Amino acid sequence: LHAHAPKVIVFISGSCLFGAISRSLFKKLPIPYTVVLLILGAILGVVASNVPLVEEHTRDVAHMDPHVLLQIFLPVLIFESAFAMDVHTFMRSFSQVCILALFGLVVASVLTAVLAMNLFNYNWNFSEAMMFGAIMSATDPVAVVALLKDLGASKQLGTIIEGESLLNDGCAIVIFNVFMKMVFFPQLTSTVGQNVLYFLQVAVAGPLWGYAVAKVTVFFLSHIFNDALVEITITLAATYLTYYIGDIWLEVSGVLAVVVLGLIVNAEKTSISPEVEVFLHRFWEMLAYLANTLIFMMVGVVVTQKALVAVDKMDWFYLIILYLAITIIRGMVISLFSPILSRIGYGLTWRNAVIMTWGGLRGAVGLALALVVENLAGNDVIGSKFLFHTAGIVVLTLVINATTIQTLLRILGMSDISIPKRLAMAGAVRRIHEGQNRTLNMLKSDRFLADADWDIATAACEISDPYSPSPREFADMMEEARLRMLKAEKISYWKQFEHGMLAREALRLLVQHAEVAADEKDQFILVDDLKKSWQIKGIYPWLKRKLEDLISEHHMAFEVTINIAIVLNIVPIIMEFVVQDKMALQKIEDALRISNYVFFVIYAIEAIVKILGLGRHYIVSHWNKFDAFILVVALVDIIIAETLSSIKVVKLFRLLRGLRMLRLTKALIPKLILVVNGKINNQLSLGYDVGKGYIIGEEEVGKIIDRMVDNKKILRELKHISETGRLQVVKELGLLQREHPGIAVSVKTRQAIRTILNHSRETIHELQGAGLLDEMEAHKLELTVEIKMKRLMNAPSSIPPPPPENLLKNVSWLAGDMKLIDFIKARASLLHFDYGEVIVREGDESDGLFLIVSGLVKLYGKSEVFEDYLTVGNVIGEMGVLTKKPRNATVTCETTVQVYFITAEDMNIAIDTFTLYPSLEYRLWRVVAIRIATPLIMEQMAFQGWTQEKVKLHLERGYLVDLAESHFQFNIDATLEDVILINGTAYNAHTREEIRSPCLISRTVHKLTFQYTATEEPRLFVVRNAEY
């Protein structure tokens, strides 16, 4: 309670209250709240100049040390800016931002510096003018990206402006740091070589240091389970130690390190627990908000105390001229590079350039650097002028540029809402309005709410729309069909995502392509544009093959023990020689000489044991030759040390590093192979998600448009485009399996578990929603799911492809029936086929089954109408042997192929032999039945909200009826959902109407009767309601 109390708290706490007041009072007014904070800070400053008591509270901030200002606020501002943004659209447009942020910053700064030299009468030198330019070129576009996120062009113009701001803020501090030393801390004139190393440290070592710290950080985040506090604390510690260690100890650019760390930790959001990801965004937003309020408050105080005392009348004239100049300079730079930017990324239109030119608001980062000059100036007038102009420009930009950006967007015609969005919002609002009427009518019947005031209720719950054969005939219908197709596709991608079938990156790629296609004439989604997702860069296969060659050459303990021995031996090999470089402690240092002999003996025993185990074959492996040369050198230098100028010592210093530490590469190379596998896996995993998402999208939409577009000539074209896309996608993804078998298996197993766990989570919420499972108990199981989700990210990047005999075990109708697996495995024969060979042809009798264990085969049949590709795991000929009808399609190998062949005679014997309740006949028809059934139920369900998987899960509940038990079937709405005829022909009992084999049965039909025939025996599939 004495005067020693921390008076900084009242300021920090008071700043939060003032920020809240300014943010709430001016929420609907156009002027940003940050300007109000500057005025409040000025009021506080003039007050503090007159009432001593308040001065005691501002003192600890209004005269804050620069090397606490920068070390605390800047890492927060830069990390939040890096952590908040969309990295993937940023990386897919990286070069355009780099061109306009690095080189754009240089020209903008130099031009501002020249202006500051020539116009202003302050007689500044080029170092000071470059500090001025660096401060004046730092942008804070938050107020503009916020609008662009809502109105439109969010994935194009929002990211470039935000990324440009991020990079220009990062580089401005570097320039400001460089020129601050040459102004306030001038050293002796450095050599050109010294300067070059200085450039490498700030420019190259910074990003490398940040990259290393990030890759270490994400590694540990991936191994933290059920501990959110540790994750948040690790993020904080990593971000603050990256700046401190990089800036103070390593003499490396801290800001750029944090930029890279934030970007990487954003890109690897999957390694963070989902519940902590949603917390980190709000946490860093809050820290940045605190930082901004303090900077504006401090600026408001210090300008009033010690900046405005030195402003002359002509200084205002320069401020206006400077404001005009930097705005002109920014637009000049954007236009001058515009020819270059037009060729890379999303080129800038003239209206986009104006928004960027007008949207370049200045903010805290600029002001923070101005406070450094004010403090380091030591009451030299340079400090006042720096802070005066930086505050002036910020106020002008916030009062003029920010307050008119919305009207400029309206004028330029970018604030309009597209008809599709307006219709979607209107329909959603109307549906919401209808839903409330249903609820209100239901509530009015409740006994305990009959006395409620329904006028107030109805007024309160209202939701209002926020946005409130001729050539021409054929051209218009084509456009309507095209846009309706694209809109249906976008719906499918969202349904797939909401049910966990796609990762978000695949969703955003697919949606971006759909929207881009919508905006171009006669443009559908082109698989050639999607191909970039699953193209593997050539460097990684090459590295994998080379590194496997290096490592593809007895006890378990030797390698681990010795590798530990080496990794520890770095400690002597550093601490002796580094201190010897200073001695050039001897009472202690000689102990390391003695222990060096013990390490020699360790490696010697290792070599002796290895020679004994390998015997004469020790020389066969080149890796061991180095293992012997190391011992030779160690013995040689030990003899010199024991038995006997500098050549006897410096040689030791060098050799006991060179031949000492390079033998860890044996252990390392496998880790590099794993990293390379991971890089391929991350690209191949995205490829499958995008490709498979596209195929599902096309299959779902193709069943919709049959009931949306009237003109058949339009209808044929659209379904032609969908099919020519589907085939190319399924082929490209099929080939990648042959290129990278094990990584494909890893991807496919990872998708499988990801699906199982998601559906597992739904059952918990169903049980929790039904009250069978308490809230806490459900939470305890839901954690077990989420930990298992996080362990998938750490699963091996390659699973060795199972041998052919394993695939038979995992076939659907062979699963779990050992006596049948043994029967088939014995009689199943493996066949090899070369490229272009036909396995079977149309019209051939059904000789047997083919189980593709490797390769890719092309199906082509007249049933050119039919065309498809099948790959590992799929089985060909099931319909054939069951019905004994001829082949459906010709099968051609697109790659060297292996197939397990089971003769139709073996199948018939197996069908006769294995006749328990889950009969092999029942199983083979069930697997066939669902494939035939799924298209029909999906065609019926086309208008409704299910995905294809919910249609399958709906079908999996079904069963085949034993029409031998009763040769007629009757339907009941209360206990039966739908019925599908799979093979045969069926008669409605009341009319004997012809229903042919593939038909789905209409719900009006009551009773079905069949003809007792053997040649086309009736097979029928049925699904009961969940209540049986």
Swiss-Prot record:
Chain segments carrying region Interacts with the transport core domain: 504-519
Transmembrane regions listed in the UniProt entry: 8-27, 33-50, 67-83, 94-119, 126-151, 155-180, 192-223, 228-250, 254-267, 275-308, 314-343, 350-377, 382-412, 556-584, 585-612, 621-644, 647-673
Motif (Essential for sodium:proton exchange): 168-169
Main location: membrane
Ranges in coiled-coil conformation: none
Positions on the Cytoplasmic side per record topology: 28-32, 84-93, 152-154, 224-227, 268-274, 344-349, 413-555, 613-620, 674-1028
Region S4 segment of voltage sensor domain: start-end pairs: 647-708
pH dependence: Optimum pH is 6.5.
Membrane topology: Multi-pass membrane protein
BP GO annotations: potassium ion transmembrane transport; regulation of intracellular pH; single fertilization; sodium ion import across plasma membrane
Site for Contributes one equivalent gating charge, residues: R654
Binding locations of a 1,2-diacylglycero-3-phosphate: H4
Subcellular location: Cell projection, Cilium, Flagellum membrane
Region entry Interacts with the S4 segment of voltage sensor domain, spans: 474-519, 711-770
UniProt topological domain (Extracellular) ranges: 51-66, 120-125, 181-191, 251-253, 309-313, 378-381
Positions of region (Transport core domain): 94-181, 314-412
Regulation acting on activity, per entry: Gated by voltage and stimulated by cyclic nucleotides which shift the activation voltage closer to resting membrane potential. Not inhibited by common sodium:proton exchanger inhibitors such as amiloride.
A cellular-component GO term for this protein: sperm head
Chain sites annotated for binding 3',5'-cyclic AMP: G877, M879, G880, R887, N888
cNMP-binding domain: annotated span: 819-902
GO MF assignments: cAMP binding; cGMP binding; potassium:proton antiporter activity; protein homodimerization activity; sodium:proton antiporter activity
Additional note from the record: The VSD and CNBD domains are not functional in mammalian SLC9 orthologs. In addition, the conserved Asn-Asp/Asp-Asp motif that coordinates sodium ions in NHEs is lacking in mammalian SLC9C1 and SLC9C2, suggesting alternative transport mechanisms and/or substrates.
Function: Electroneutral sodium:proton antiporter that regulates intracellular pH of sperm along with capacitation and fertility. Activated in response to egg-derived chemoattractants, couples membrane voltage to sodium:proton exchange and transduces membrane hyperpolarization to cytoplasmic alkalization to cAMP signaling and ultimately to sperm motility.
Oligomeric and partner information: Homodimer; the dimerization is stabilized in the presence of phosphatidic acids.
Note on domains (UniProt): The dimer domain comprises TM1-TM3 and TM8-TM10 regions. The dimerization interface is formed predominantly by tight interactions between TM1 on one protomer and TM8 on the other. It contains an hydrophobic cavity that accomodates phosphatidic acids likely playing an allosteric role.
Protein name in the entry: Sperm-specific sodium:proton exchanger
Source species: Strongylocentrotus purpuratus
